[PDB]
């Protein structure tokens, strides 16, 4: 049987901003995870449901690799029942999450001398996010009364903001690449296995 493209996700060279985190379904294939957990190349590997070693002997029905880039020190907010601007305005994990979070430092791949300002994130929003929902719009947030028509003048302002990802930044201030795997077990047979 086939092999799942975990290589084309974990070892893909262009992750998108956390405000527009990129979802990729994994299905109709069979691969392993106890090689990833064996790889030991990662710096944060937390499986919130089943333990990582046990899961290789399982089968899954709805696997979605979700990839984005955040700051090293804000990784704790990628967790159920969590506050933090990432988990508030950008990417909330459901409190009944059953999967794995995989964060590894990506300072060299991303942090340029002038910073990789392709990486943005939402810092303003009217309300938080229901889990696994995403906001992609880039309208100028109008907190005033008048329509400001894309002008970041008085009382209007951009909702997204950049990251100064440079090698001069601290360890926690260096960018981390984050992947999240969700293993739902619902009214369906399995398509992924070990």
């Amino acid at each position, epitope marked *: 049987t086939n092999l799942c493209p975990f290589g084309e996700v974990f070892n893909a060279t262009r992750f998108a901003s956390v405000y527009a985190w990129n979802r990729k379904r994994i299905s109709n294939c069979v691969a392993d995870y106890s090689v990833l957990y064996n790889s030991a190349s990662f710096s944060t590997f937390k499986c919130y449901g089943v333990s990582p070693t046990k899961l290789n002997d399982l089968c899954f029905t709805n696997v979605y690799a979700d990839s984005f880039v955040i700051r090293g020190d804000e990784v704790r907010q990628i967790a159920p029942g969590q506050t933090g601007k990432i988990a508030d305005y950008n990417y909330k994990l459901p409190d009944d999450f059953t999967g794995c979070v995989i964060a590894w430092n990506s300072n060299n791949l991303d942090s340029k001398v002038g910073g990789n300002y392709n990486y943005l994130y939402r810092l303003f929003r009217k309300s938080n996010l229901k889990p696994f929902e995403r906001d992609i719009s880039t309208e100028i947030y109008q907190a*005033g009364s*008048t329509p400001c028509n894309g*002008v970041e*003048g*008085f*009382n209007c302002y951009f909702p997204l903001q950049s990251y100064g990802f440079q090698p001069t930044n601290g360890v926690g201030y260096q960018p981390y690449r984050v992947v999240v795997l969700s293993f739902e077990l619902l009214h369906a047979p399995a398509t992924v296995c070990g």
Partner: antibody, heavy 114, light 106 residues
Framework: QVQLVESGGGVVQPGRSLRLSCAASGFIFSSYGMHWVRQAPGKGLEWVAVIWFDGSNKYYADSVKGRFTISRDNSKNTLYLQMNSEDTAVYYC???????????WGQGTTVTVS | NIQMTQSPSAMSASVGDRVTITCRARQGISNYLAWFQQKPGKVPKHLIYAASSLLSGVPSRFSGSGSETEFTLTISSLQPEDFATYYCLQHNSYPYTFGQGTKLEI
């Protein structure tokens, strides 16, 4: 060349009501935000109310019982009907921008409650 | 109702010098503070918004700065026309509120 043709200040009674309007000059009052501010002699500025174009309004700490705002976009006149009672103030009705940022105002309805 | 205050309720500072005026919020006003100027015979002229955005046209001798609990407005130089009453307006929470503060010369 923008301004507000303010309704002149009435001489009301303590406990009575009144109502003042401000016609627009130069700008398009149809899709701007109109603020009402009252400056009482013997005191300082005090923010009173804010009106959008799409019927969304917000009010002040003490002027949220006997005040009601409206924008007669047919006559382009931002108006309000208020109660009265400690309200003798020189009311300004400024209108908002994202660039200028409220750089045109009313001209002082000299309303007194006595 | 967030309330603000301005400690130097009046300052007698002469021409061609440098002064400051402080606003202090009894709650949290992240960055959206505005500095207004009013003179008798004139109309209030919104000088600064967002506590850092030096609005266009007005001179550069007006510089605001602060962070979410306290704010200042520095007048580095004084050509005499810049003597007036100075107010500050919070606009993070929508019930906007004002302060009190004036200027004087020796």
């Amino acid at each position: 060349q923008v301004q507000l043709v303010e309704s002149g200040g009435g001489v009301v009674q303590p406990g009575r009501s009144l109502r003042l309007s401000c016609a627009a000059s130069g700008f398009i009052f149809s899709s701007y935000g109109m603020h009402w501010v009252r400056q009482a002699p013997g005191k300082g500025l005090e923010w009173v109310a804010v009106i959008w174009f799409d019927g969304s309004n917000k009010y002040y700490a003490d002027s949220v019982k006997g005040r009601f705002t409206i924008s007669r976009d047919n006559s382009k006149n931002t108006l309000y009907l208020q109660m009265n009672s400690e309200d003798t103030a020189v009311y300004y009705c400024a209108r908002e921008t994202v660039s200028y940022g409220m750089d045109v105002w009313g001209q002082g309805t000299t309303v007194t409650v006595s | 109702n967030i309330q603000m205050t301005q400690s130097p309720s009046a300052m007698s500072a002469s021409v061609g010098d440098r002064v400051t005026i402080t606003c202090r919020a009894r709650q949290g006003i992240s960055n959206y503070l505005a500095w207004f100027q009013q003179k008798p015979g004139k109309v209030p002229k919104h000088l600064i918004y967002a506590a850092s955005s030096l609005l266009s046209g007005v001179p550069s001798r007006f510089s605001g700065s602060g962070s979410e609990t306290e704010f200042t407005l520095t007048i580095s130089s004084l050509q005499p026309e810049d003597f007036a009453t100075y107010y500050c307006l919070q606009h993070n929470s929508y019930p906007y509120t004002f302060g009190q503060g004036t200027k004087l010369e020796i």
